[PDB]
Curated annotation (Swiss-Prot), chains A, C, E, F:
Catalytic activity: carbamoyl phosphate + L-aspartate = N-carbamoyl-L-aspartate + phosphate + H(+)
Pathway the protein acts in: Pyrimidine metabolism; UMP biosynthesis via de novo pathway; (S)-dihydroorotate from bicarbonate: step 2/3
Keywords: Pyrimidine biosynthesis, Transferase
Assembly mode: Heterododecamer (2C3:3R2) of six catalytic PyrB chains organized as two trimers (C3), and six regulatory PyrI chains organized as three dimers (R2).
GO molecular function, one term: amino acid binding
Family: Belongs to the aspartate/ornithine carbamoyltransferase superfamily. ATCase family.
BP GO terms, sorted: 'de novo' pyrimidine nucleobase biosynthetic process; 'de novo' UMP biosynthetic process; glutamine metabolic process; protein homotrimerization
SUPFAM superfamilies per record: Aspartate/ornithine carbamoyltransferase
Lineage of the species this protein comes from: Bacteria, Pseudomonadati, Pseudomonadota, Gammaproteobacteria, Enterobacterales
Top-level taxon of origin: Bacteria
InterPro entries, sorted: Asp/Orn_carbamoyltranf_P-bd, Asp/Orn_carbamoylTrfase, Asp/Orn_carbamoylTrfase_sf, Asp_carbamoyltransf, Asp_carbamoyltransf_Asp/Orn-bd
Protein name: Aspartate carbamoyltransferase catalytic subunit
Swiss-Prot record, chains B, D:
Function: Involved in allosteric regulation of aspartate carbamoyltransferase.
Cofactor(s) of this protein: Zn(2+)
UniProt name for this protein: Aspartate carbamoyltransferase regulatory chain
Gene: pyrI
Residue sites binding Zn(2+) per the record: 109, 114, 137, 140
Entry's Gene Ontology cellular component terms: aspartate carbamoyltransferase complex; cytoplasm
HAMAP family reported for this sequence: Asp_carb_tr_reg
Length: 305, 152, 305, 152, 305, 305
């Protein structure tokens, strides 16, 4: 009776305002009002086609705070199955069989979809296709934006990183975008530039934005921060002007905050840690809520709203 | 009948008589699609055409109860073609292969990772243009262009 | 009060009609009538001396649908213990200690037995000794035969594969054999031939059979199919007349079905998948029932029959 | 000319007019071999034949200056076929696809290891029979049978 | 002016009586009359597409007793090249370029041939294609037969092993066969049976033979022995009647000898070592002569006969 | 008495017209006039701090056509030394000791230099520092340009690739640049763009150039081609418009030629192979000459000019 029922979740693109405003709000309370046993008698599948752990460790914990089960595996090593023969779609069709649901992560980029098709009525959650989509991340992100600035409307956003191979600013953006008129800032070093497609779409739509290579002014008329990471790929003398580092002297502050779907390294400084705008963490602890919401939506038929 | 036509078909009895659509890319179609895995007899050659000579009707292709878009589908490889009818008293009104929006099994995410290419799929790509033709890849949500695809 | 109590299960040979007709029927309902909590307060051991996963993933799921616990590990890598010193029988004697039961799998071929001896009153389930026995598989197989053809009596069986190193047609056969007068067919390529011992025993007994290299006629007077796998070992130009492949044009059908303790590869065709006689899967989903039956027999004292 | 024949060719000008050799395995040939990567026009259909009706000449195939064994080569997939000539005054004397002994690029060591299948090859297999047809695989000196090969 | 010049050697099949009687006799003296510098100014390629070492270590040593050079590599690890892109036929075409010749070994089974084509005038020696051919071995074998029994004519041969996947009895046989009327014995355990093709050919030709599972009588009317190895593949309870073991009490001897292209393990006993019929070794030391012969044939134009 | 004596070679930058015109011409004959024994009594070091093989296999072969020796190793595995303690500069200082010279390759990027300092009078050749310099490559390249177009003066060059991380167009360019007025073309996909430093230098100097994304026209007024490679790093859906592929229909040819310090993969087509402008190979075989020249310059005092 719930919009979400037996629907497989897999790509943020593929989801509707509403929907967001829902997991968004089923999790808000869940957060204020937990329920272990919503799920008892359930078992789930914590398939780690590509070991991942931060994501897994939180998925899971999720299953169990709702009450429930697991059976899963992380791979690349001492994990088996089919290989030099079998199909990730034989794995599933059997798996499909006993399970009640499937978070599952992978290297390739169809899997959740590829697995939809073969797994009849057992919803799949996508922790990752590959370099393609992570709905859990961005809704995880999206909320958190929400409990903070207090709305996903009339914002001052900015995401300073490697917006190029950036897996999550790509989602974030287009979810943060469905909602409206908010201007985005893209402090990217012409190489971790912003792809010319997620734009024509900002443009595409009716929305706005600007460019800068500072963390500076862009920063005072700014509300939540996504610093991605920066790494390999580029030379190792390509970590030349690594100046897009968040650290401590900003004061010309506001009452915004900073985020980063970890894991930080250089991006940002212990020094900061401490002081407001910090959260990268809360940002994390808030995925345990963002997920749950789903899974109980995903698997229940109705709610205690 | 030493090669030709005799498009006697139309229900319980059919024909197909592809005759070089554009050129040397109608063979394609053939595998590009079934239509040889099938009873009814077939007919082709290469018009090496300019179209028609003295008076040229103003059309070509195949005729044989494809479907509706058993085509629309060619929209991509022979947009400039045309189906069926009859010379005395007949039916196949203004029908041109006109973009489908979702080619089906013919093609191939050039992406190296799509699961596509690893198992029991379907090529399903979706089509949007204004640009120069766009094709997405339910699989690996990525966008390539009629080009580089068309090939593979 | 139950025949099965505190008895360790480990080899199909070593089990009695009755017994089969029991797990066979305790699982039939369990299937029609589940019970999570039959087992609560239980923890079990999911010992994967030899990582295996399809088998593990289902074992386990089993523990939990009955309600319960786990603690286990899959190995060949980042797993520890004793090594260049300790005994799989030191592992056990301690394990033995906290656990309530032990599924456990291995490379060698005594283990379950070897472990019996040292594990005093904590039953061991054998997911595998080695190339020796897998009771769970064949009873898993056996049933499934049952819910299908509707009896394990007056059948038309056939197992086309690599009946030589075939781990499961070896069990199957001798269980399917305890019951009676049924004729078996062995479409094996003189090399994956049928060992001269499981026969003298068909013969040994009072039973029958025939030989063929077709999938053909053998097939019309046929009821359930075991296609094994076919692989390595033999040359790679030894996969010459790989003609013992199940695929699609059979029509000269019946209303039988096809099975394969996966995982398929070449053996059989997507094309089939679809259409009846298919099941390889259900065959799988039915192991979650076949196991459970045991474990609650194994560990409870009585029943709600 | 609404589909047919008009086997006007024979030098500077040619045709090819494969007409269902055995059936639905003449498409094959087509890719099975070039002969579509080529100027001259082509002609086919499906005779759904019994051969011929009233008086049937007693032959079929293609006609077009293949070579000599541009055939002999089909010896394997349509042994029962036949080439070219002319209806008034003509030349293509008793010529039947008759085993070559070495198929060339069509096929595939089913062997999993042949380097064949790993690089820039050639299918070259050699043919001997008395048995039921034998094919070796300069590559991986192994012997399989017209069968299991023919497929792949 | 030499039959052998610039011809690539690769498969025993593909070689003519003559030819054999040649490397056969160019090596006989070479053996009695060495020449370092026949080759000076030469470099060669010791390509170990598949590390192999016994074979490599002797190849090589060969190059150098003739005087000369090397450049090569053994692989499966810390060796490079092309991979996830390049062709063993790009490797060669460059290699081809500086070298003067190529011994080379591999996993796949075309390579030497596949490499012929691409390596214009630089002869390739095949130390192995795969499971296909090893000319060096069998001519190595063939000779040695010769310096012993004193001819490759009117013999009593026997090869007790795993004549099935046996790589060398397959060559041996058909070389030992070109010559004439000699009767062969095949003490093979119906599973390491003799393939039905190298026979129809014995038969094919005009030649003879018998079968036995003894080492016994077959043995008194016997002249040179090929015991192959016996291993893996088959069960490990498949090393059941491993009775085809050569050991010590034979006395009902003759003045024959025993051979084995190593490496022995169980096949044969230290105990034997000692006493005549032994040689497995000399058999080896004689490959350093068998090779050389080639390479100088292979690369010189004429001889000091 | 020779400019080159006891000088360590390591970076093309760090070398003078003259010098180039020298190895350039000592190798031209060497090529027309070989000398094994120029070097006898020499041993050299073929240090493969980073296994590399195409480069190694040719270096080496070099040592020996000149007559000489080797002792070396390829690494990343079963190679030893110091580790979790010792210095590539302890390795050297000892090595230094017995050797007569050192080709040596590495991961890091000082090594040859770092090793100069510590290796007193034993010249080092650099097969690679890292992502920094490969003098051997580019002089190897440079020549070859020469025996072809017949001069390194008044050319039509073009290098279509991944001029960004391109290791060799970076050298090539600046060597091909020392000489004069020649115009260069850079068919690079704005991402494998041309770095803004090797330019300001074209500009810096007095030289010219243009840009295009075709292989087309740029191509008719063109004389030697450097296609680099294209790979990893960028997405795998980043191999989107891989249109900078050299293949076959060019005809609108000239009598130029194509080069590629291998190894090709996609860059260019078998189809081409064949026909002129091909050479990628000769380009290779010409490194055996380019090196030698050095080493005998490097180590002799004078010449037979
Ligand atoms: Zn895709
Ligand atoms: Zn082959």
């Amino acid at each position: 009776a719930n919009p979400l029922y037996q629907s497989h979740i897999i790509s943020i693109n593929d989801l509707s305002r509403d929907d967001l405003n829902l997991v968004l709000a089923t999790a808000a309370k869940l957060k204020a009002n937990p329920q272990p046993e919503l799920l008892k008698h359930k078992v789930i599948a914590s398939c780690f086609f590509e070991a991942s752990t931060r994501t897994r460790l939180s998925f899971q914990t999720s299953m169990h705070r709702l009450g429930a089960s697991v059976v899963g595996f992380s791979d690349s090593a001492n994990t088996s199955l089919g290989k030099k023969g079998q199909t990730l779609a034989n794995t599933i069709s059997v798996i499909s069989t006993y399970v009640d649901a499937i978070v599952m992560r992978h290297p390739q980029e169809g899997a959740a979809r590829l697995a939809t098709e073969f797994s009849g009525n057992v919803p799949v959650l996508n922790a990752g296709d590959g370099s393609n989509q992570h709905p859990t991340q961005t809704l995880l992100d999206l909320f958190t934006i929400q409990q903070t600035e207090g709305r996903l409307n009339n914002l001052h956003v900015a995401m300073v990183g490697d917006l190029k191979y950036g897996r999550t600013v790509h989602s974030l953006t287009q979810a943060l975008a469905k909602f409206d008129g908010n201007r985005f800032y893209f402090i990217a070093p012409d190489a971790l530039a912003m792809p010319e497609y997620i734009l024509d779409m900002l443009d595409e739509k009716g929305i706005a934005w600007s460019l800068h290579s500072s963390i500076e002014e862009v920063m005072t008329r700014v509300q939540k921060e996504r610093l991605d990471p920066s790494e390999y790929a580029x030379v190792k003398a390509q970590f030349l002007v690594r100046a897009n580092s968040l650290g401590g002297l900003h004061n010309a502050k506001m009452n915004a905050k900073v985020l980063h779907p970890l894991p930080r390294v250089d991006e940002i400084a212990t020094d900061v840690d401490k002081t407001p705008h910090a959260w990268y963490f809360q940002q994390a602890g808030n995925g345990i809520f963002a997920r749950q919401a789903l899974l109980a939506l995903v698997l229940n038929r109705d709610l205690v709203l | 009948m030493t090669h030709n036509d005799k498009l006697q078909v139309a229900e319980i009895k059919r024909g197909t008589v592809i005759n070089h659509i554009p050129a040397e890319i109608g063979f394609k179609l053939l595998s590009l699609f079934k239509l040889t895995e099938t009873q009814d007899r077939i007919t082709i050659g290469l018009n090496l055409p300019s179209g028609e000579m003295g008076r040229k009707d103003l059309i070509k292709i195949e005729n044989t109860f494809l479907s509706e878009d058993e085509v629309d589908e060619l929209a991509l490889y022979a947009p400039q073609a045309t189906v069926n009818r009859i010379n005395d008293y007949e039916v196949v009104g203004k029908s041109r292969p006109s973009l489908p929006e979702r080619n089906i099994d013919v093609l191939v995410c050039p992406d190296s990772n799509c699961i596509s290419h690893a198992e029991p799929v379907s090529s399903s790509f979706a089509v949007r243009r204004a640009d120069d033709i766009a094709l997405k890849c339910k699989y690996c949500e990525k966008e390539f262009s009629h080009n580089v695809v068309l090939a593979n």
